[PDB]
Write a protein that binds this ligand. Sequence first.
Ligand SMILES: CCCCCCCC/C=C/CCCCCCCC(=O)OC[C@H](O)CO
Ligand SMILES: CCCCCCCC/C=C/CCCCCCCC(=O)OC[C@H](O)CO
Ligand SMILES: CCCCCCCC/C=C/CCCCCCCC(=O)OC[C@H](O)CO
Ligand SMILES: CCCCCCCC/C=C/CCCCCCCC(=O)OC[C@H](O)CO
Ligand SMILES: CCCCCCCC/C=C/CCCCCCCC(=O)OC[C@H](O)CO
Ligand SMILES: CCCCCCCC/C=C/CCCCCCCC(=O)OC[C@H](O)CO
Ligand SMILES: CCCCCCCC/C=C\CCCCCCCC(=O)OC[C@H](O)CO
Ligand SMILES: CCCCCCCC/C=C\CCCCCCCC(=O)OC[C@H](O)CO
Length: 510
Amino acid sequence: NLLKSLAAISSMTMFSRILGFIRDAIIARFFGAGAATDAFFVAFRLPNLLRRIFAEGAFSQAFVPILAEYKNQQGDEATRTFIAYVSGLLTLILAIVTLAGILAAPWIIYITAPGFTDTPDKFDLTVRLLRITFPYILLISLASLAGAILNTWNRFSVPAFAPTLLNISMIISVLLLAPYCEPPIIALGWGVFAGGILQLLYQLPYLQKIGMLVLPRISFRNSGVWRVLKLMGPAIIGVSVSQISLIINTIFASFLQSGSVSWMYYADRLMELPTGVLGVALGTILLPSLAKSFSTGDHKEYQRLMDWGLRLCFLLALPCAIALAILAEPLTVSLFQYGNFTAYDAVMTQRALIAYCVGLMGLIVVKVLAPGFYSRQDIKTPVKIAIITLILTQLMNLAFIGSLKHAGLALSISLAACFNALMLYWQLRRQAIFSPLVGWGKFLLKLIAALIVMVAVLLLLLNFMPPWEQGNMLVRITRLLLVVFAGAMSYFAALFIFGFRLRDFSQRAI
Ligand SMILES: CCCCCCCC/C=C/CCCCCCCC(=O)OC[C@H](O)CO
Ligand SMILES: CCCCCCCC/C=C/CCCCCCCC(=O)OC[C@H](O)CO
Ligand SMILES: CCCCCCCC/C=C/CCCCCCCC(=O)OC[C@H](O)CO
Ligand SMILES: CCCCCCCC/C=C/CCCCCCCC(=O)OC[C@H](O)CO
Ligand SMILES: CCCCCCCC/C=C/CCCCCCCC(=O)OC[C@H](O)CO
Ligand SMILES: CCCCCCCC/C=C/CCCCCCCC(=O)OC[C@H](O)CO
Ligand SMILES: CCCCCCCC/C=C\CCCCCCCC(=O)OC[C@H](O)CO
Ligand SMILES: CCCCCCCC/C=C\CCCCCCCC(=O)OC[C@H](O)CO
């Protein structure tokens, strides 16, 4: 049951996600949304996101299958040797990249955030934070490799808990080290650094428990390393396209007023809060199922899995996007507006979040529909569609920046994701790969009715409540949780009244 899989993934990631939002709230309270946070987000978050794009789009899809074949077809000694050579090559490459990026950090910041050049102190702070960021890439890459090995041995709780330590270390660095750092946010940077270390050392004993903890070594003649490189080859183009798109979006953001990057960051975090599970969970668990369907010839199961993923997208991401748009002020004020995060920052974050809610659905649908081509050994069509999406994204950025500013950049990304999803779906329909099952009309009608009930309940409750800035954090968060509970319970109650049953949707998972 893939619904069971999504529940398990949610339960395993809950604690880390909660602490990540506590960390974001601490950052907002102590540093607000200004030049220092902009420098931190450009220097740390952008390289981390580029690294994650490369790791999940290229490295893992090549390393995990070869590791599983070593585990199942070869012995533990040959597998340990393969792991040692993999880790050694990764460590050497990332050490070279760390050195080169520390030496070239000013030009890196220059081309990724040109608008920062009119403020020399902000630029220097960004370059300094990037110089601290670069070793974290190597640390967190080794930690990710450990997590992948542990997942291959069916150990998912430990890697899903690992980022808790990063969040805790960042929080402690802000609370205890920021008063002693000359630019205070510098402490946060080191809190990330130590975090990486912790995330590694937390997973090393478990690696030793399964007999897969080995010293790294270098070898340019290992069969497995060449197998992984050959499988990594055809994904570099797809990785580079999304990397370039993110870099140009950052370039556009760098020319806006101080705080725009931070407002966008807080908005996208708020958007990720309820739907962080579905996005990646559905994709990673649907790709192997559809691959097996296509290999066995069971086209009915392929169609049913795809249709179930799409219907779950409609059933869970749509109400979240609508409710996030409606509750933008309650969310921003109850979660962020404390200390140096002012009401102005709250309003700007609300604008960006409302812009992001338009494309939440496009993102969740893209992550489900891309395996429709990936499972059939088709990397070319998603890359073509992604190139077109990049072109449209930059066109809309150029058109929207002067008037809508940061919110306009967010809306550009949202519309681009929407049309990315639509192009993927229309390609699937065109090649006769997928055709939806019967009963989408009644499904959508009941969905619309439940959504109307939810919106009515939300607006009714919001019309009765005092200004959200009055009251301390306890009061605000209690009110927000109560309103969210009422909205969600009304939505699911309407869904049940109109015929939706949990058993019936679980049967479509498998
Ligand atoms: C809006 C300003 C005029 C148009 C700029 C388009 C730049 C396009 C290319 C950027 C990549 C990096 C190349 C180097 C860019 C340096 C830009 C710079 O330093 O701009 C400082 C200025 O004060 C800022 O308003
Ligand atoms: C820079 C300074 C860094 C200082 C770092 C200090 C870290 C202290 C540890 C706290 C434990 C974390 C919270 C534990 C809460 C319960 C954890 C638990 O039981 O988790 C089991 C796990 O899910 C099974 O996989
Ligand atoms: C104020 C609120 C702002 C935020 C709002 C967030 C939600 C927006 C999403 C709407 C769903 C639209 C779905 C349209 C796409 C599905 C139908 C479709 O694609 O139909 C053509 C297809 O070819 C048939 O096979
Ligand atoms: C916000 C828009 C962009 C982001 C989201 C992109 C969604 C892409 C399509 C998803 C599956 C749609 C399946 C539609 C199946 C319709 C089948 C049909 O013929 O339905 C007959 C019924 O009577 C009346 O619809
Ligand atoms: C790996 C690197 C890949 C690089 C790929 C090439 C990037 C070339 C430049 C992009 C557009 C820059 C546009 C800059 C000017 C538009 C923003 C103008 O922004 O004004 C801002 C102002 O604050 C309100 O209007
Ligand atoms: C059907 C859809 C129904 C609605 C779906 C959800 C919509 C968004 C609501 C989220 C509330 C989250 C409340 C808790 C947020 C985390 C707060 C926390 O633990 O830390 C923040 C604090 O400020 C640190 O000091
Ligand atoms: C234009 C200049 C931009 C400069 C700023 C960005 C530089 C760093 C980004 C990527 C390189 C490093 C990529 C490292 C990938 C490691 C993959 C890995 O370890 O993956 C383990 C596991 O498989 C995971 O699931
Ligand atoms: C991980 C990424 C590594 C970099 C990827 C390519 C970036 C190319 C961009 C611009 C030219 C940069 C030329 C840099 C020439 C050396 C500068 C140098 O060594 O400067 C030392 C000085 O002390 C100050 O740190």
